[PDB]
Amino acid sequence: TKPLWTRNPSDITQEEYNAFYKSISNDWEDPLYVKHFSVEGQLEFRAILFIPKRAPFDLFESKKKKNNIKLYVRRVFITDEAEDLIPEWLSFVKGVVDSEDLPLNLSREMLQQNKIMKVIRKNIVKKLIEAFNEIAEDSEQFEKFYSAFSKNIKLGVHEDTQNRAALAKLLRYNSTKSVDELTSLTDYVTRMPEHQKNIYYITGESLKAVEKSPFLDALKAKNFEVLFLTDPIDEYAFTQLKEFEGKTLVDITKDFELEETDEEKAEREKEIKEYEPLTKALKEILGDQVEKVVVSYKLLDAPAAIRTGQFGWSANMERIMKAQALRDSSMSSYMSSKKTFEISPKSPIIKELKKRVDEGGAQDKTVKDLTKLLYETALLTSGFSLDEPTSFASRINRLISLGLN
Amino acid sequence: TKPLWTRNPSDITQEEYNAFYKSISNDWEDPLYVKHFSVEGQLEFRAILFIPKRAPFDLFESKKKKNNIKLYVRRVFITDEAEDLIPEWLSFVKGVVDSEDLPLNLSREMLQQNKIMKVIRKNIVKKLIEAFNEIAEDSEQFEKFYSAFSKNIKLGVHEDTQNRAALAKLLRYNSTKSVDELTSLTDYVTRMPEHQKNIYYITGESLKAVEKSPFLDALKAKNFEVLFLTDPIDEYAFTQLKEFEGKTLVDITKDFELEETDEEKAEREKEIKEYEPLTKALKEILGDQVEKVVVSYKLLDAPAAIRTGQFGWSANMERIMKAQALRDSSMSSYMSSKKTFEISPKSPIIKELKKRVDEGGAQDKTVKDLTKLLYETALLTSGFSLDEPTSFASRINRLISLGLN
Amino acid sequence: TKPLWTRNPSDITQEEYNAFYKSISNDWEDPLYVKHFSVEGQLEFRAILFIPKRAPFDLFESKKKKNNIKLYVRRVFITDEAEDLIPEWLSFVKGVVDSEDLPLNLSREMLQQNKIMKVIRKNIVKKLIEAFNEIAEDSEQFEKFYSAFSKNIKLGVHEDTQNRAALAKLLRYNSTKSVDELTSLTDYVTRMPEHQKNIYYITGESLKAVEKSPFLDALKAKNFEVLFLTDPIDEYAFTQLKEFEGKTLVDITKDFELEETDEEKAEREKEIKEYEPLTKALKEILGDQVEKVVVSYKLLDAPAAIRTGQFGWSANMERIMKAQALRDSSMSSYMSSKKTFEISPKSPIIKELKKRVDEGGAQDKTVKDLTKLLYETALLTSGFSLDEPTSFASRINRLISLGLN
Amino acid sequence: TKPLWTRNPSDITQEEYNAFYKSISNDWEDPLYVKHFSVEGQLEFRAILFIPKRAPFDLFESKKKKNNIKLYVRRVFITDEAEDLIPEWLSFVKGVVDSEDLPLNLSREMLQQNKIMKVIRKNIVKKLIEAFNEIAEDSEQFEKFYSAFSKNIKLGVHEDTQNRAALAKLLRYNSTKSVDELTSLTDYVTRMPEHQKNIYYITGESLKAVEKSPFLDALKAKNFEVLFLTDPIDEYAFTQLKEFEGKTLVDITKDFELEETDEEKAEREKEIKEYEPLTKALKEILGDQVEKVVVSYKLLDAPAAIRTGQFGWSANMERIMKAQALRDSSMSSYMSSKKTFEISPKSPIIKELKKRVDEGGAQDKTVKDLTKLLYETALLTSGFSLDEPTSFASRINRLISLGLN
Amino acid sequence: TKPLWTRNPSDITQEEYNAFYKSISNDWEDPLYVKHFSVEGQLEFRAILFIPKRAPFDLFESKKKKNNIKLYVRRVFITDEAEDLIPEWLSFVKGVVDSEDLPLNLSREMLQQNKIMKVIRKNIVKKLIEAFNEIAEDSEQFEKFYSAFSKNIKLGVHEDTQNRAALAKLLRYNSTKSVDELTSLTDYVTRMPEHQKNIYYITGESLKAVEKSPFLDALKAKNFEVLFLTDPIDEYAFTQLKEFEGKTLVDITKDFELEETDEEKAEREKEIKEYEPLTKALKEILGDQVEKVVVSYKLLDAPAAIRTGQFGWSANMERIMKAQALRDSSMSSYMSSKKTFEISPKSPIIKELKKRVDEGGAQDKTVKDLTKLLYETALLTSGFSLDEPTSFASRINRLISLGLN
C-alpha cells in the first residue's frame, strides 16, 4: 500500500486521480487536467496538482482563502495551510506536495527552510506553466481553462518577473482582426506586416464601448490590428510586460506611428509648422487644463481629441480613480496624468479656426468659446468626465441659437 | 464590595466610571457621556452604557465587529457576544447590562428567552435616545457626538420603526438658509412661511456639487429652504421617515408646489395645452430613453432638464449604482430610474422648437438633432452621465459648423 | 460545459444533481428533493436548493452554524457565508444561488444591496414552501421530511409573518379524533361541526401526559376535536398564528365555549349564584396564591382544577421557566401567570364544602385544610409543581389521621 | 530596566504590580492579592500570578475561555495560550510564568516537555493554595475571595487528588450549629463530641428548603452538627473527598449512626421485629417503585420518608437529572437511584396501619390507598417529583371523600 | 428510513459503510476496518468508528486538530467537536457515536455529564483495541495499520494505564534475532532461554547507529535477543510499561545480568577488589564529569565505556535534548543524566593503567592525560558528544608525538 503521489503517473489510472481529486476538492466534477510530476537533484519532491474545470472561487471578489494544497514531508502530513508554497495567482490549484528536504521543528530563525520552500514553489510554478502550455494544445480544453483562469494568468504576468514572458503567451483577447473569437499575442504578431513596429491595444469599459473609439480609425486605415482590453488587470499586466517583441502600446495614449507613409512624413512638418500659431493660441485659452496642444495625423474625421501622456495611467484608469472621489465624501486628492489636446487639420472645423487666428482673431469670445467647447467635447469623446455643468450648459445654448434664429 | 453597576449613579464618582470605561474600551480618552440606569417592573436590569467622544470604528467601511457590551445575569458574567442585545446602528456603545430574568442553560427552543432579550434591547434603545436628547442640550458636547455618530443616527431612522420619529429630531444638515452652520429639522420648520406645505431637500454628491443644481433656483425665488443631503443614508432615511410635519421631498424628483401665484395656476393650462403637440413630438424622438416629456414652470432660464420620478432612487443614487457597473465587467446594467424630460417655455430655444413643429417640422433631421442634443445636455446639467461618446461628439461638431459654416 | 445551475432542469439528469449535492454537503445519502428554479423580472436569479432526507444538524441543540449556500453573482463565486440570504428556520438548506443584480464592492452604506438581498431571500422562501407543498403530495417522502423538519416548519410559522398561513398547512399533529395518525389543520377544520367556533388544542409534556388532562372531558362530551401539542415551539407558533379560520386556543387556559345546547346556559346562572358564597369563601383562604375562584362546567368528574389566564404563558411554559430557577441557585420567580381555581359542582366533594359554608363553617380548620389540599392537588393534576414539602406532607397525614382515628 | 517578574518582590512596590495587573487583565479594579514567587532546584521559574477581587467570568455558565497567563521561556515571550500550564479550576488566574527549562521547537513526540510543564503546573497550584491560605488569614479579604471563587475551590477539591485535602480547609458552609455565619470543616470537627463518628451534611435546593428536612430532627436530638450544601459541586466534591477525619455523609442517604445511648439499641430489635409483617405488607403494595420498606428511628414525627441508597446519586441529583428528561422530549429514565421507604413507629398513623395488618387487613383497598398515598407524599416531603397526576389526584379526593361522607 | 448506525451490522453491506466513511472523511480510499458496535446496560450507545488505511495526519508534527467524530444524543446531532469523547492517541479515528444518556442543556456544573462522557470513552477505547486485535489477525491488514499507527499505539501504552498491558501486545520492532522483519514482544519472549530473566532493548538514533553499539557484544555472546528502539516514545513507552513478563531494560543503562557463569561470579569480586585503587584514582581525575568509575564484565575488547544510570533518560535521549540547546542561544544547559565510567580489565590498556597506579603513579600528567582521553573517547564510542574542542585536540596531538616523537 503506497501513497498515490509516490507511484509512477504512467501506472496510476484516471479514476484514481479522479477520486483523489474529489476527496480533496469538494468539486462534483472531474478535474480539467492533472499534472503529476517529481523533481530530483539539488532538492527532491513529488506532487500531484489539479486544474479544475471551473474556478472554485475567484481572486478579487469571491472572499479570499489560503491555498489548501496538502504539504507533506518525507510522506508525513504536515499542513494544508503551507506558508508560501504557491503564489496567490495560483491559489485555485489543488493537490499534494511531498518534500524530502523540508526540516521539521526548526526555529523560524532558521531561514534555510524558507529558501527550500522558495525553490519548491518556483518549481511548482514552472511545472504548472508547462501544464497550461499543454492545455493550450487542445482548443476545447483550453477554452474552459481560459474562461476560468484568465485573470489568474493576467495577475501571473503582473506579478511574476521570470515567467512573465511565458505567461504572456497564454493571454487571449478580442481584436479588430478577431471580432468574435479570441486571438493570441503570438497570433497577433503573425498578422503583423513587415513594417509594423509595435503591438497596439486599447483599454476601456467594455467591448461595445471600445470599438466606438475615434482612436481606431487611424490604425485601421494603416491596417494594423488593435487588441481590446476591457479589464483593469489587462492594463496592469500590459504596462508591466512592456513588450512581446515590439513594445505594446495603448493608442489612447501618446502614440507615434511610422513614417506616416514617408511621403506624409515629408509634408507633415510643412503643415505642422503652418499650424504653430494656432497651437500656441489654443493653448493660451486652455491654460493649465492642458499640458499641450498638438497637431495629429493619428486622428481622422474628428476635430480634436485628448491623449493622456504615455508613462502615466490611462484615461480608463482616471475614469476609475476619479469616479471614487465622487463617492468618497472627503477625498478629492489626485494621483492622475497629463492631458494632450490633439487637433486634426483634415477637419474643416480646424481649418476654420486657423483662418480666424491668421486674421488677428487670437482672442475672439467666439474663438474662445469654440476652443473651450471643442475641448470639453474631446473629454467626452475621449472617455473622460468634463468640468462642471454650468460652464458647459451655457456654451451650448449660445450655439443652438445660432443654428436656429 | 459591590459591582459598580449595582451601585446608585448619584453615589459613584466620575473617575470610577472613567476607569471602568477605560478598562472595557481601549479608548485612551474619557467617555463623552455615561448613561447608567435601572429598569424595574415586568422585567429588571441595570446598565451602564458609554458614549465615546469619537467613533471607535465606523459602520460601513471600517470592517464590522459584534458589539461587546458585557452581558450579566444575576450578577454573573455570561458573555460579551450577546445575541441581539443591541441594534447594529448602536454597535459603538460600550458597557454592561445585568439582567435579573434571563434564563441560563435553556434549550434554544425556548423562545421566551429571545423575547426577554428583545425587551431588554428595546429599553436600552429608549434610554440611549434619552441620552442623546440630553447631549443635544449641550452645544459643544453634541457637536462631537454628531460629528461621530451622525450616520448611526441616520441608520437608526431608517431601521427603527418606533423611534424613527424621535431620532429625526437629532438629525442636522446644511441648507440654503444655513450655508456654514448645520440646522435642525425642527429649525427648518420654524423657517417655513405659513403657506409652505412641504419640506424641501436635495440629494447629490457633495455640497459643492449640490448647490449648482438648476433645481434650486425655483425654490429660492419662492423663498423656500432647501436642505442638502450629500450622503447615501440621508436618502434611505428620508424616504423612510416620509415626513416630519409636511411630507419631505427631493426636488430632483417629481415635485408639485404652491399655487405658483394662483394667477399662474390659471394661465398655465392655457399654455401647457399649447405645447401639447410639441410634448408628443419630442417624446416621439426620445422614444424609450424617457418616460415622458413635460412642460415645467419649476424650471427657470434653462431650456430643458431631467427629473427622476418620485418614489424612486435619486439621480444622485443612480450616479452611484451606475459608476459601479463601470468598474465591474460582470455587469453592463444598472438600477436606472424613470426619467422625466422637462421643457421651459420661457426659454426662447423652446419657443423656437414649438415654431418648427407648428410648421410640419415634426420630423426634421434638424429638429431631431436639436431635441436629441438638448436631452443629452439635460443629463449633464441634471447630474447624469450621458449615452455614448460617438453620438454626442457627432451632434456637437455638426452644431458648430452648421451654426458657423 | 456550463455551470449546472445555469442549465435547464428538464435537461439535467438525476445523478448530476446527486453528485452536485454530495460535493456540497458531506451527506453520504442522496438528497430528499431538489428544487431548481429561476426567477426573472424585476430581479433575476437561478438556484438549486436541496432538501436532505435527514437533518444535517438541528436548530436548538446541535450547536448552530451559518448557512452555507454558495452565493454567486453573475456566475462568479462570492461567498458561502451569505449575509441574510436565507432565514434561520431554513438553515438546513443546501445549494447555490446565482444573482444577476447584486452589486460587488459597494460601501456597506449602500442599502440598495441589502434590499436586493432581501427580495432574493423572500423568493427562496416562496419557492421552498412550494417545494414542501410538493413533498406533501407524497406520503412516504413527506414522512421523512416531516420527521426531520417539523421544528423548522414550526419556527417558520412563528417567525415568518407572510408565509405563516401556508406553513401552518404543513404542520401535523395527533388529536382526540386522530390518535395514531397525524392530522392537518385543514383536516381538523373539516371535522368541525357547524357550530364549533374555535380550534382547540392542548399543550403538555408528552402525548401520554396530555391525554389524562381533566380539561379534555368537556370538549369530548361536546364532540370537539382537541389537538395535542407536546413541543414548546408548538406553543410559540400557535400563539403567533393566532388563528386558522376560527381562533386557535389552549384549553388549559381561560376558555369560553358555546352554550351547552343553551338549556344549560339557562340553569347555570341559577347554580353559579348559589355557589357565590362558597366562591368568596375559598378565595379568602387561598388569598394571593390565586387570582380568583370560579365554578366550571368545563370540568367533569374532578373536584377542582387550575387554568392559567388566557393571554399568558401556559402551564406547560411555567413548568419550564420554573424548572430553571430550580437549577439556577439565584432565581426567585419569573413571569409565572395568573391562576384561576376552578370548582365542579357535580363533584360531591364540592357539594359538601358548600354545605359546611352554608352552615357558618366559613373558617373551619377542617374547611381550610380541605380547600388548601384541594388546591395543591389541582396544581399536581393541572401539571404544576406545588408549594413546599412540609405544608403538603402535613395536610395529608392529618387527612389520613382524622381520616381514621 | 529588567522585566518585573525577574525582580525581587520585596523590591517591587504596589502600583507597579497594580499597573502590571491592569495591563494584562482589563479589570478596572486593583488585584485582590498578588503572589510573586520563584522556584529553584530541579527546575526553575519565577511567576507573578494575580487573584482578582471578583470573578472575571465564571466556570460553568459564562462561556469558557482558555487561561491567558503569559508563558515565557528564558525571558522570551512564547504564548498566552499555554498547553496545560494551569488547571481549569484556576482558569481565573492572571499573570506571567517564565520557565528556564522548557525546550523550544522540539517535536511534540518529545514528552520530556510535557513532563516539565506538568511540574511547573503542580508548583503553581501549590503556591496558589499557599496564597489562598494567606488570604484566609484576613476576614474581609477572604470574604471577597470566597464570594468569588468558592466554586473553583469546590471543583479543585473534586478534581485535584493531592491538594484535595488542603482545599477542603478553605471550604465554608452554613450548618445547624452555624446558621448565619459560615463554618469550616476544621471547625465542625472541633464541635464534634467524643463519640460522633462521621461528618454529616445534607444536600438540597437552597438553605430555606434544606432546613425543613425531616432527616435533621434525628441528628439534632443526637446533638450532631449538620452542614448545609445547596450547590451541586458541593456534592461532587464531597463524594470525592470521601472524608476529612471521619467519613463525610449525606443524611438523605443510607446512614447508620451510633447506638442511641445503647438502651434504644436494645429495644429496637424487639420493635423492628414486631413491624416485620407490616414491612413485608407495604412492600407487596409498592412493588418495584421501591427497593425496600424499613423502620427508622432516624425519622421523628413524620409517618414515612424516602432515603436513596448510599453509594448512589442523591435525591438532589435525581431532581436535576430528571428535570432534564422533562425538557428533552426524548428521554425515558437515566440512572435514578434505589429508593428506601422509611416507616416511623412513633407516628400514630403507622401504629394504625400495623393494627389493620395484624387484623387480616393485608390487602384492604383502604390500606392499599393509604400506603400508596403515604408513599407519594414521602416523595414530595423527601424532595422528589411524584408519579403522575391522575393516580395522585384521585387518591386525595377519596381520602377527602371518605374523609367526610 | 433509519440512520445507518442504528441498523444491525450484519445487515448493512460494505459500500454503505464505505460511502458513509467517504462522506465523513475526505479520504479517497476505502476504510481499512470498520468497527460498528453497540453498548447496552448501565449506559447505552451505538457507534461506527473507522480505521483509515493511512494516517490522515500524524500526532507530533502534522499540526494538531481536534477529533471530529460526530457526537449524537438520542439520534440528534450535537457536535463533532466532542469534549473528551476519545483520547489524543486515537485522534485519527472517525465516525459516529450516538448516546442515549448524555443530558442536553445542563449547566457545566453538573459533572454527571462528564462522568457519562468518561464511560462512553472508556468503552470506545475497549472496542477499538478489540478491533486492532482483530486486524492483528491479518498479516497484510496489520502491516498497514502498524505502518500508519504504530506511534499512536506507543503513545497509548505511555498514556493509558488500564490498557497499557494489552496495547503492548500490538507493538512490533526489529531486533538482533529479527534483522529485516519486525518481531512481537510475545515472540521475543518465546525466543528467551529458560535462564534469561529480562527482556533486553536499546535506544538510539536509528537502526544503522544502534547496531554499532559496543553494548550489544555482551548479550550476543550470551545469546540474548536485543530489541531496537529508534524512536523517542519507544522509550517513554517502555519506561512506563516497566515489564512484559521479565522487566524490560535498555542495556545502555545500568544493567545486571545472569550468573556470568557462576564461576565468574566467584573470581570477579577477587578481581574487582584488585582494581579498587584504580577505580578511586580515575574518579579523582574525572571529578564531577562522572558519577562513578566501575569495572565491567559487560564490556568486551574495549578499554572503557559509558552507561547512563538506569531510571534516567538514555544516552539516545540526551543526544536529542542536547542537540537542541545547541540550536537555542537562550539556553547553554541540558538534561544530562548520571554517567557511569566503565573499565574493562581484559583490555591491556587498563591492565597497564593499574600498573602505573600500583606504582605511585596516581597523579602522573601521563596517567591523567590517558584517563582524560579514554573518557572523552568513551563518550564518542558510547554515542555522546564530548567536552570542547581545545582540550580534546590538544590531548591527541600530544599522544601522536609522544607516541612517535
Swiss-Prot record, chains A, B, C, D, E:
Query: rRNA-binding as a keyword?
Result: no
Activity regulation, in the record's words, is:
Inhibited by geldanamycin, macbecin I and radicicol, which bind to the ATP-binding pocket. Co-chaperones CDC37, SBA1 and STI1 reduce ATPase activity. Co-chaperones AHA1 and HCH1 increase ATPase activity.
Supply one GO BP term. Answer: protein targeting to mitochondrion
Write one Gene Ontology MF term: ATP hydrolysis activity
Can you say where in the cell this protein is located? Cytoplasm
Mutation effect (A305D): Reduces ATPase activity and client protein activation
Highest taxon listed in the record's lineage: Eukaryota
UniProt keywords, alphabetically: ATP-binding, Chaperone, Cytoplasm, Nucleotide-binding, Phosphoprotein, Repeat, Stress response
Show which residues constitute the signal peptide.
none
The primary site where this protein sits is cytoplasm
Residue numbers carrying Phosphoserine: S385
Which consequence is recorded for altering A304T? Reduces client protein activation activity
Residues bound to ATP: R108
One GO cellular component this record assigns the protein to is: perinuclear region of cytoplasm
The UniProt record's further free-text remark is: Present with 444943 molecules/cell in log phase SD medium.
Q: What domain notes does the record hold?
A: The TPR repeat-binding motif mediates interaction with TPR repeat-containing proteins like the co-chaperones AHA1, CDC37, CNS1, CPR6, CPR7, HCH1, SBA1, SSE1 and STI1. CNS1, CPR6, CPR7 and STI1.
Q: Which family does it belong to?
A: Belongs to the heat shock protein 90 family.
Q: How does it assemble?
A: Homodimer. Interacts with the co-chaperones AHA1, CDC37, CNS1, CPR6, CPR7, HCH1, SBA1, SSE1 and STI1. CNS1, CPR6, CPR7 and STI1. Interacts directly with the substrates GCN2, HAP1 and STE11.
Record protein name field? ATP-dependent molecular chaperone HSP82
